[PDB]
Design an enzyme around this catalytic site. Structure first.
Site, PDB file in Angstrom:
ATOM      1  NE  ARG B  25      -1.621   0.934   3.977  1.00  0.00           N
ATOM      2  CZ  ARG B  25      -0.947   1.908   4.577  1.00  0.00           C
ATOM      3  NH1 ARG B  25      -1.017   3.150   4.107  1.00  0.00           N
ATOM      4  NH2 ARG B  25      -0.207   1.642   5.651  1.00  0.00           N
ATOM      5  CD  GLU B  63       0.612   1.905  20.932  1.00  0.00           C
ATOM      6  OE1 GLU B  63       1.149   0.858  21.363  1.00  0.00           O
ATOM      7  OE2 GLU B  63       0.413   2.129  19.707  1.00  0.00           O
ATOM      8  CD1 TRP B  85      -0.291   5.578  18.337  1.00  0.00           C
ATOM      9  CD2 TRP B  85      -0.924   5.324  16.195  1.00  0.00           C
ATOM     10  NE1 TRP B  85      -0.475   4.236  18.106  1.00  0.00           N
ATOM     11  CE2 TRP B  85      -0.838   4.052  16.797  1.00  0.00           C
ATOM     12  CE3 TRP B  85      -1.298   5.418  14.851  1.00  0.00           C
ATOM     13  CZ2 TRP B  85      -1.124   2.868  16.091  1.00  0.00           C
ATOM     14  CZ3 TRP B  85      -1.583   4.247  14.152  1.00  0.00           C
ATOM     15  CH2 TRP B  85      -1.485   2.992  14.783  1.00  0.00           C
ATOM     16  CE1 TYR B 111      -4.547  -1.803  16.750  1.00  0.00           C
ATOM     17  CE2 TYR B 111      -3.947   0.470  16.416  1.00  0.00           C
ATOM     18  CZ  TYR B 111      -3.840  -0.844  16.074  1.00  0.00           C
ATOM     19  OH  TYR B 111      -3.038  -1.216  15.001  1.00  0.00           O
ATOM     20  NE  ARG B 151     -14.302 -24.783  25.096  1.00  0.00           N
ATOM     21  CZ  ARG B 151     -14.780 -25.977  25.439  1.00  0.00           C
ATOM     22  NH1 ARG B 151     -13.958 -26.948  25.851  1.00  0.00           N
ATOM     23  NH2 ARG B 151     -16.086 -26.220  25.331  1.00  0.00           N
ATOM     24  NE  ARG B 152     -18.189 -20.172  24.499  1.00  0.00           N
ATOM     25  CZ  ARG B 152     -19.464 -20.175  24.851  1.00  0.00           C
ATOM     26  NH1 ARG B 152     -19.936 -19.259  25.711  1.00  0.00           N
ATOM     27  NH2 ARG B 152     -20.257 -21.100  24.341  1.00  0.00           N
ATOM     28  CB  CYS B 171      -1.376  -3.521  12.952  1.00  0.00           C
ATOM     29  SG  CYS B 171      -1.256  -2.186  11.772  1.00  0.00           S
ATOM     30  CG  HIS B 172      -2.124  -4.352  17.910  1.00  0.00           C
ATOM     31  ND1 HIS B 172      -2.923  -3.920  18.941  1.00  0.00           N
ATOM     32  CD2 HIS B 172      -1.365  -3.285  17.559  1.00  0.00           C
ATOM     33  CE1 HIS B 172      -2.688  -2.643  19.184  1.00  0.00           C
ATOM     34  NE2 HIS B 172      -1.751  -2.233  18.356  1.00  0.00           N
ATOM     35  NE  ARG B 191      -5.040  -4.881   9.484  1.00  0.00           N
ATOM     36  CZ  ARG B 191      -4.214  -4.155   8.757  1.00  0.00           C
ATOM     37  NH1 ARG B 191      -3.647  -4.693   7.677  1.00  0.00           N
ATOM     38  NH2 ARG B 191      -3.908  -2.914   9.135  1.00  0.00           N
ATOM     39  CG  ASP B 194       7.075  -2.099   9.892  1.00  0.00           C
ATOM     40  OD1 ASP B 194       8.194  -2.647   9.908  1.00  0.00           O
ATOM     41  OD2 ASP B 194       6.900  -0.898   9.616  1.00  0.00           O
ATOM     42  CG  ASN B 202       2.648  -4.080  17.476  1.00  0.00           C
ATOM     43  OD1 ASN B 202       2.800  -4.248  16.249  1.00  0.00           O
ATOM     44  ND2 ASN B 202       2.175  -2.931  18.005  1.00  0.00           N
ATOM     45  CE1 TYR B 234       6.062  -1.303   4.079  1.00  0.00           C
ATOM     46  CE2 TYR B 234       6.200  -1.709   6.409  1.00  0.00           C
ATOM     47  CZ  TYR B 234       5.461  -1.455   5.299  1.00  0.00           C
ATOM     48  OH  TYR B 234       4.090  -1.384   5.383  1.00  0.00           O
ATOM     49  CB  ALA B 289       6.684   2.408   4.873  1.00  0.00           C
TER      50      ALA B 289
HETATM   51  C1  LIG Z   1       4.246   1.220   8.148  1.00  0.00           C
HETATM   52  C2  LIG Z   1       3.976   1.247   9.614  1.00  0.00           C
HETATM   53  N1  LIG Z   1       4.696   0.423  10.372  1.00  0.00           N
HETATM   54  C3  LIG Z   1       4.505   0.417  11.741  1.00  0.00           C
HETATM   55  O1  LIG Z   1       5.117  -0.387  12.458  1.00  0.00           O
HETATM   56  C4  LIG Z   1       3.542   1.384  12.293  1.00  0.00           C
HETATM   57  C5  LIG Z   1       3.411   1.559  13.670  1.00  0.00           C
HETATM   58  C6  LIG Z   1       2.560   2.529  14.198  1.00  0.00           C
HETATM   59  C7  LIG Z   1       2.470   2.766  15.690  1.00  0.00           C
HETATM   60  N2  LIG Z   1       3.556   2.165  16.456  1.00  0.00           N
HETATM   61  C8  LIG Z   1       3.220   1.037  17.316  1.00  0.00           C
HETATM   62  C9  LIG Z   1       4.822   2.582  16.376  1.00  0.00           C
HETATM   63  C10 LIG Z   1       5.354   3.578  15.543  1.00  0.00           C
HETATM   64  C11 LIG Z   1       6.698   3.795  15.785  1.00  0.00           C
HETATM   65  C12 LIG Z   1       7.238   2.955  16.742  1.00  0.00           C
HETATM   66  C13 LIG Z   1       8.553   2.949  17.400  1.00  0.00           C
HETATM   67  O2  LIG Z   1       8.882   2.014  18.136  1.00  0.00           O
HETATM   68  N3  LIG Z   1       9.356   3.975  17.100  1.00  0.00           N
HETATM   69  C14 LIG Z   1      10.661   4.141  17.723  1.00  0.00           C
HETATM   70  C15 LIG Z   1      11.774   3.770  16.743  1.00  0.00           C
HETATM   71  C16 LIG Z   1      11.708   4.561  15.434  1.00  0.00           C
HETATM   72  C17 LIG Z   1      12.818   4.207  14.486  1.00  0.00           C
HETATM   73  O3  LIG Z   1      13.686   3.378  15.002  1.00  0.00           O
HETATM   74  O4  LIG Z   1      12.899   4.645  13.355  1.00  0.00           O
HETATM   75  C18 LIG Z   1      10.860   5.550  18.261  1.00  0.00           C
HETATM   76  O5  LIG Z   1      10.110   6.443  17.669  1.00  0.00           O
HETATM   77  O6  LIG Z   1      11.644   5.805  19.156  1.00  0.00           O
HETATM   78  S1  LIG Z   1       6.047   1.903  17.412  1.00  0.00           S
HETATM   79  C19 LIG Z   1       1.802   3.292  13.317  1.00  0.00           C
HETATM   80  C20 LIG Z   1       1.911   3.132  11.947  1.00  0.00           C
HETATM   81  C21 LIG Z   1       2.800   2.197  11.419  1.00  0.00           C
HETATM   82  N4  LIG Z   1       3.031   2.110  10.047  1.00  0.00           N
HETATM   83  C1  LIG Z   2       0.389  -1.168  12.164  1.00  0.00           C
HETATM   84  C2  LIG Z   2       0.392  -0.610  13.569  1.00  0.00           C
HETATM   85  C3  LIG Z   2       1.025  -1.546  14.552  1.00  0.00           C
HETATM   86  O1  LIG Z   2       0.865  -1.352  15.747  1.00  0.00           O
HETATM   87  N1  LIG Z   2       1.791  -2.518  14.107  1.00  0.00           N
HETATM   88  C4  LIG Z   2       2.212  -2.682  12.840  1.00  0.00           C
HETATM   89  O2  LIG Z   2       3.121  -3.480  12.588  1.00  0.00           O
HETATM   90  N2  LIG Z   2       1.604  -1.953  11.908  1.00  0.00           N
HETATM   91  C5  LIG Z   2       2.190  -1.948  10.541  1.00  0.00           C
HETATM   92  C6  LIG Z   2       1.812  -3.151   9.653  1.00  0.00           C
HETATM   93  C7  LIG Z   2       1.913  -2.507   8.276  1.00  0.00           C
HETATM   94  O3  LIG Z   2       3.302  -2.460   7.915  1.00  0.00           O
HETATM   95  C8  LIG Z   2       1.370  -1.100   8.517  1.00  0.00           C
HETATM   96  C9  LIG Z   2      -0.140  -0.997   8.341  1.00  0.00           C
HETATM   97  O4  LIG Z   2      -0.378  -1.034   6.933  1.00  0.00           O
HETATM   98  P1  LIG Z   2      -1.571  -1.967   6.363  1.00  0.00           P
HETATM   99  O5  LIG Z   2      -2.867  -1.478   6.933  1.00  0.00           O
HETATM  100  O6  LIG Z   2      -1.258  -3.377   6.733  1.00  0.00           O
HETATM  101  O7  LIG Z   2      -1.417  -1.758   4.879  1.00  0.00           O
HETATM  102  O8  LIG Z   2       1.716  -0.786   9.867  1.00  0.00           O
HETATM  103  C1  LIG Z   3     -17.452 -25.577  17.597  1.00  0.00           C
HETATM  104  C2  LIG Z   3     -17.960 -25.666  16.175  1.00  0.00           C
HETATM  105  C3  LIG Z   3     -16.913 -26.017  15.164  1.00  0.00           C
HETATM  106  O1  LIG Z   3     -17.179 -25.952  13.963  1.00  0.00           O
HETATM  107  N1  LIG Z   3     -15.737 -26.490  15.595  1.00  0.00           N
HETATM  108  C4  LIG Z   3     -15.459 -26.836  16.861  1.00  0.00           C
HETATM  109  O2  LIG Z   3     -14.434 -27.472  17.139  1.00  0.00           O
HETATM  110  N2  LIG Z   3     -16.327 -26.484  17.819  1.00  0.00           N
HETATM  111  C5  LIG Z   3     -16.159 -27.034  19.174  1.00  0.00           C
HETATM  112  C6  LIG Z   3     -15.167 -26.325  20.076  1.00  0.00           C
HETATM  113  C7  LIG Z   3     -15.724 -26.598  21.470  1.00  0.00           C
HETATM  114  O3  LIG Z   3     -15.423 -27.947  21.824  1.00  0.00           O
HETATM  115  C8  LIG Z   3     -17.213 -26.528  21.205  1.00  0.00           C
HETATM  116  C9  LIG Z   3     -17.684 -25.103  21.361  1.00  0.00           C
HETATM  117  O4  LIG Z   3     -17.835 -24.877  22.759  1.00  0.00           O
HETATM  118  P1  LIG Z   3     -17.295 -23.485  23.372  1.00  0.00           P
HETATM  119  O5  LIG Z   3     -18.152 -22.369  22.784  1.00  0.00           O
HETATM  120  O6  LIG Z   3     -15.827 -23.323  23.044  1.00  0.00           O
HETATM  121  O7  LIG Z   3     -17.495 -23.662  24.902  1.00  0.00           O
HETATM  122  O8  LIG Z   3     -17.439 -26.934  19.845  1.00  0.00           O
END
Ligand SMILES: Cc1nc(=O)c2cc(CN(C)c3ccc(C(=O)N[C@@H](CCC(=O)O)C(=O)O)s3)ccc2[nH]1
Ligand SMILES: *c1cc(=O)[nH]c(=O)n1[C@H]1C[C@H](O)[C@@H](COP(=O)(O)O)O1
Ligand SMILES: *c1cc(=O)[nH]c(=O)n1[C@H]1C[C@H](O)[C@@H](COP(=O)(O)O)O1
Ligand SMILES: Cc1nc(=O)c2cc(CN(C)c3ccc(C(=O)N[C@@H](CCC(=O)O)C(=O)O)s3)ccc2[nH]1
Lengths: 290, 290
Positions: B25, B63, B85, B111, B151-152, B171-172, B191, B194, B202, B234, B289
């Site tokens: 992106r 944070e 941020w 978040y 388990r929920r 992201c998290h 999901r 970086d 994180n 990256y 980035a």
């Molecule tokens: C592309 C992208 N990657 C990320 O990891 C990301 C993270 C955040 C928020 N976040 C969770 C963080 C942003 C920056 C951090 C950090 O640890 N910065 C340090 C080191 C910076 C550097 O080494 O260049 C600092 O600022 O001291 S931690 C927001 C947008 C993002 N976007």
């Molecule tokens: C988002 C914020 C965070 O706390 N941790 C992360 O690692 N990121 C990174 C993942 C990705 O590089 C970027 C988000 O971009 P996208 O939405 O995945 O395209 O920030």
């Molecule tokens: C739920 C349905 C499915 O498709 N797969 C599964 O394994 N289960 C199982 C997990 C657990 O044994 C039970 C769900 O009970 P709970 O909500 O986790 O207490 O079905």
């Protein structure tokens, strides 16, 4: 002895050996570990349907097509003699959830309803939800065609606002898709996995889904990854699973897709088949905990 | 050479060795793998704050407390000289997301807003949301005390209905909690990670969260598991990460909790400290980035 079906057999062994005892919701009791992951290749048409136990493939297929349609009526599955959701849709079970006004079989806004209609207001399982809510699955398919590098291809059934309306909260709860080198991969986060019963079926289901989606968007299937939260064996399954562990896996079957429709919800069982499935002949019964 | 900080260093190496070239992106370009998991023990008071690179611990803490309070105004972190941020809250970035009416610094329902107020209608970052939405974090703390085998115990920020209001999608995105043998564990589904910049921060954040939650409910910390979707380096970070890989890890520091308040949102930085943190001194710059 680490790849393919051995991922599953090794998980069974790990839980039996180091799982902790838990007094779970059903009252049956389990052995449990947290956070295990398994990975399955979908290359060369492979689909990881277990061979050390015969999996209810017809049920996998019909449950998945029911999910993809957004349907939530267990009676629709029961008309095909697929009874896997009947117990959680019974009058007794629904009443135990406080869902007295629900018709028997109406599971609420579960699974595929969230996939296709996230945020829509639920009425009954027979209501028309066309155009209502967020169609996460259709949106993923569009993104796969247009921007496959996207890092947000998420399909969730975990809707906090709707949990109280569901017969059970989703077990398989959030999936993410990913593309590299022309291959589609899927990772499922499953909060709770009944390792003896649901987990093999769920692996087959999402692997099938990944094959079907790939064929819609011009990609080849890559990998299916299952990441579990509470991975557990019910006490009632321990002996049968020990028996399964003595079986040597055979090669996984292949999926043959004969055609792909225009919309994913139009897939029917006549459009694909399972090739070369050779499960061990002795059926293994895993009683469902309730 | 596999446990602890080597989980992270080996992930870096793996991406460098077998990560696929993937555009992204931001237009920067990445090397990427899908589905890797890392696991860190929190026993013996350990907290996995990297020693091969100095982590911004005060930023991690502030944070996290901001998230726990449900707060979403980057200007409040900037007042504390935490600027992580600021870029995603700028006028230009907000306008690029279509968020024309949003004041600078107002990240939207991101978040911790979802953690404490899931489903509430967002107004601004300065609005009072007390009693609005679903307090997933409080519910988890109650469940840990009353029914720890449940388990929920899920806390999600992935709300499809609110993504368009967020400066960035989370992201998290979804965490699950688990109890075994008096120990609290946490698994995070992230999901998009970086690996050079966000991921170390994180890891420290959710490990701290797990320590704090355990102290609120009478448990000891167990394990923190990070499961990634798109784990990427990256292209602009490759050379600095290769330099980091030459540094020998030192033992992780320990978290010392001095007191626990009545509600988790009352935690302050005076209530805990990091003992024995001895990171390599030479600062490594990983430009964000954008
Ligand atoms: C592309 C992208 N990657 C990320 O990891 C990301 C993270 C955040 C928020 N976040 C969770 C963080 C942003 C920056 C951090 C950090 O640890 N910065 C340090 C080191 C910076 C550097 O080494 O260049 C600092 O600022 O001291 S931690 C927001 C947008 C993002 N976007
Ligand atoms: C988002 C914020 C965070 O706390 N941790 C992360 O690692 N990121 C990174 C993942 C990705 O590089 C970027 C988000 O971009 P996208 O939405 O995945 O395209 O920030
Ligand atoms: C739920 C349905 C499915 O498709 N797969 C599964 O394994 N289960 C199982 C997990 C657990 O044994 C039970 C769900 O009970 P709970 O909500 O986790 O207490 O079905
Ligand atoms: C406690 C519990 N565990 C489960 O795995 C579970 C699964 C479903 C739905 N589902 C996804 C399935 C239910 C039953 C399946 C199945 O494969 N049954 C086979 C084998 C039964 C047996 O071996 O005894 C079948 O009916 O042929 S697959 C609903 C509630 C649940 N509840």
């Amino acid at each position: 002895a680490m790849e393919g079906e051995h991922q599953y057999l090794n998980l069974v062994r790990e839980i039996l050996e180091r799982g902790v005892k838990k007094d779970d919701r059903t009252g049956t009791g389990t052995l449990s570990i947290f956070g295990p992951q398994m990975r399955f290749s979908l290359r060369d048409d492979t689909i990881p349907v277990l061979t050390t136990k015969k999996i209810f493939w017809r049920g996998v297929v019909e449950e998945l097509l029911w999910f993809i349609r957004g349907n939530t009526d267990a009676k629709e599955l029961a008309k095909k003699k697929i009874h896997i959701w009947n117990a959680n849709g019974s009058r007794e079970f629904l009443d135990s959830r406080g869902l007295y006004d629900r018709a028997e079989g109406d599971l609420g806004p579960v699974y595929g309803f969230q996939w296709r209609h996230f945020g829509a207001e639920y009425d009954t399982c027979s209501s028309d939800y066309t155009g209502k809510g967020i169609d996460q699955l259709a949106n993923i398919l569009k993104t796969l065609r247009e921007n496959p590098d996207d890092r947000r291809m998420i399909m969730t059934a975990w809707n906090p606002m709707d949990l109280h309306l569901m017969a059970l909260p989703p077990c398989h709860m959030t999936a993410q898709f990913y593309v590299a080198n022309g291959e589609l991969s899927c990772q499922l986060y499953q909060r709770s996995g009944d390792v003896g019963l649901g987990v093999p079926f769920n692996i087959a289901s999402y692997s099938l889904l990944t094959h079907l989606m790939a064929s819609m968007v011009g990609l080849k299937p890559g990998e299916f990854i299952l990441t579990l939260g509470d991975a557990h064996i019910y006490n009632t399954h321990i002996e049968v699973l020990k028996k399964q562990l003595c079986r040597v896996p055979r090669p996984f079957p292949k999926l043959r897709i004969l055609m792909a429709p225009e919309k994913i919800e139009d897939f029917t069982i006549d459009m694909f088949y399972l090739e070369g499935y050779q499960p061990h002949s002795g059926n293994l019964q895993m009683k469902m905990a309730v």
